[PDB]
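Protocol step 4 of 5: obtain the predicted structure for the target chain.
Materials: sequence only (see below). No template structures provided, no constraints applied. The aim of this step is simply to have a reference model before the mutagenesis design in step 5. Sequence pasted as it appears in the construct record:
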Amino acid sequence: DVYHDGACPEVKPVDNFDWSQYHGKWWEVAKYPSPNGKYGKCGWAEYTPEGKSVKVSRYDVIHGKEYFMEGTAYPVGDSKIGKIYHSRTVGGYTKKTVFNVLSTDNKNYIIGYSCRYDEDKKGHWDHVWVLSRSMVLTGEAKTAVENYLIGSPVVDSQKLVYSDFSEAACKVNNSNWSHPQFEK
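Step 4 output (structure tokens):
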């Protein structure tokens, strides 16, 4: 539950986003546990370059439920500066989402910030997610996430929540046969 007045707050996006490293397969790390709490850390998403823009396809099982959400990343304005809107298509409708990527380290973690405006509430809401090349945030990546958090302008870490899905997450109620495991 994150409510605010006006539109997205003050957040300086990447001066010059580079898909050089920031790409491939990434997995969520510390992303708001949401209200209803809907997530699934058991998917595989890749980033394909499409000339300036980079396609992104996400697919996983959110709380015993096959989920999928893709969207290309394109520069809203200045190619350099962040301001990269993600196109999210649905059924027979398309919406252009603007995602301002504060500042990424392009190592093993990625930060950002997105807030959608509500004409009903007048104000707006916040909606962001944290990515981590590795299922677990480590190395200098931790620093990037640490530094950012430390100087969290709005992103209240105390609110955020680090990875936490558990096989149970993936494991679906009688579906998609899976393989067991073992522990020393």
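Step 4 remarks: The domain at 1-175 is CATH 2.40.128.20 (Lipocalin). The two ends are 41 Å apart (CA to CA).
Proceed to step 5.
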